[PDB]
Design a protein around this nucleic acid. Sequence first.
RNA 1: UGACGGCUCUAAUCUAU
DNA 2: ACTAATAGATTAGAGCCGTC
Lengths: 153, 303, 201
Amino acid sequence: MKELIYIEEPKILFAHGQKCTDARDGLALFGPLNNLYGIKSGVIGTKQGLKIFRDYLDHIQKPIYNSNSITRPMFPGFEAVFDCKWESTGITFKEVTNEDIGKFLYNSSTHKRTYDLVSLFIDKIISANKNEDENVDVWFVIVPDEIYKYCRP
Amino acid sequence: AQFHDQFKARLLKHTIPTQIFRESTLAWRDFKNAFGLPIRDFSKIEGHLAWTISTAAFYKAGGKPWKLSDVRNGVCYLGLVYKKVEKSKNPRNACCAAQMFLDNGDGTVFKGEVGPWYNPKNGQYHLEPKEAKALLSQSLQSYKEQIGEYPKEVFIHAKTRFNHQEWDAFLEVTPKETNLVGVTISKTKPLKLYKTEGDYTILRGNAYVVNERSAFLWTVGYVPKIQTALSMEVPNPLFIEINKGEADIKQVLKDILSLTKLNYNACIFADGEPVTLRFADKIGEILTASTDIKTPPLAFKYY
Amino acid sequence: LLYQQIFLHDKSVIEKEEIYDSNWLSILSFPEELRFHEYNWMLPKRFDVRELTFPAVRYKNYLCTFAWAYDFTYHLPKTETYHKSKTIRIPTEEILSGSYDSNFIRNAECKRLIVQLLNKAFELRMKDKEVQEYEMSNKTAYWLEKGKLEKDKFEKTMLVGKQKDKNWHFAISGASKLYPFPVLMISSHIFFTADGKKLID
RNA sequence: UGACGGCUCUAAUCUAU
DNA sequence: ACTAATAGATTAGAGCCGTC
């Protein structure tokens, strides 16, 4: 009827007890709550899986201006924001060539090709976690656009 | 064919954090259409964009971008979404997928339940009394072990109206100290209100309490700082209604809005749905790709 | 933004009274009582409440409608021998207040057939008016022909618009719900046409 | 499946002729 | 016996679309 109550916005915690309602604005200046000293990352994908990630791996700690800062706040970089480092070091590029992805891509049965492209990628990650020593933290599976646009539900 | 759900269904035994990235979304400039323009205008939003793929990579590596400081002690924000299992032979049963929020801001998750006495393919989306004591006690015990006592109350968020055939079985396992309140979140209700002057939608956080039990909270709308609403047209306010139990509907609006800023996969001002169920169905669709996983109450750094 | 508003992030919200108009349509008046006519053989037992001129619904051995028994003399000219005292009359205010609880029909159930008599009522109106319709997947939109209205606009606002060769028409799909109170669930939709007179299939 | 929207287009169910 | 019943008011789903 002729009434409309406005409820209050809660505030989220930040580094050393800072309370800013927004997330991006409160994190581009005050930093994350918890500190981790580095990101150990790996890239698995086609030949362009590295290079496209490589061009983007160093492109995130480098600042990029936004078209409108009021709507989209500035970001100075991964290091300046997340009090951590995210660069190309310790990466284990698994060579899933387009020929091996292709012998599994061009499969008549949809249920087989979704299972085959899963098994071909899942085993190569657990092996690196089982028959290897490199302590991985986040795995960046660079799936080619030709896969998720075709191998889609 | 959604192998991304199959991606993280077979990795739950080993618990490997993963991030499915795309050439199209990482080489947007390289990818153009046949008319000489990029298929997805991408870097003009290069703010939250780099935030999301970094704060998630921060989260998938164990980082904690933020927390919650306006939460009571002894309160659990249970949110469960029933997911169809059509990946299997029949959808005659539907698995559920719940999660829990603590006073410490550590949003966890756990596998829900299966519908045993599920009436036909898509019943009223409700767990049976025989297994009603399973999910709640597991959630209560999960809170009990890390706090020492059962919570003062649990808020069971859902998109489905609860029925008495499962709440009666809830009671004998809930201690009397737990205010077993059930809040149903239903976006399907077509409420809509405008602004007479101006081409801007109404402010996020506006609410209209209809009666002592139900309410309509605008978790999505116009914003006080970003000056642009998190939507195009006027959205449907989320219909909050206390299905069972006694509680203050005004105090409930604290919780629904609070579980919209924290989304540990994105950097947006707010979420249009409570993440107590937006995160809850983020594990149901993955866990329905394969049914050969016995998974513990995992975290979100794997899904 | 000057170091993000000097690293403050002000609320930037003002507290002034703002009047907001919703998309609903409120209720003002309704018939004092709805009638549950008992036709039995009067109404053909094989065909039930699907063809009457006025909105009518069937429940148990009875026909429920907001009109009277003698109001269906055209499509069913057999109703001239019916004796009117077998018709069941129930005031509306008793159902809404929850005091209506009879073994014949329940309260929450009774609130379901009245909206049927409502939600199906409006489609009979724009048929008489100069408004055409399109059948949506889940509802029935109602649009206005291109050029049927004068000077392409009504009340100096657009009703038919031009999008390249195709045209769009603003169409509403109202519904009747009684959750907060009797309301008309008028929703704002839009549908297109190939050239303003033929729809895009 | 960056991630957030929003409805469209389909489908299914219980409560009563 | 149910044979189906047309509707309330609900539910998860896949779709493309924009993402000042």
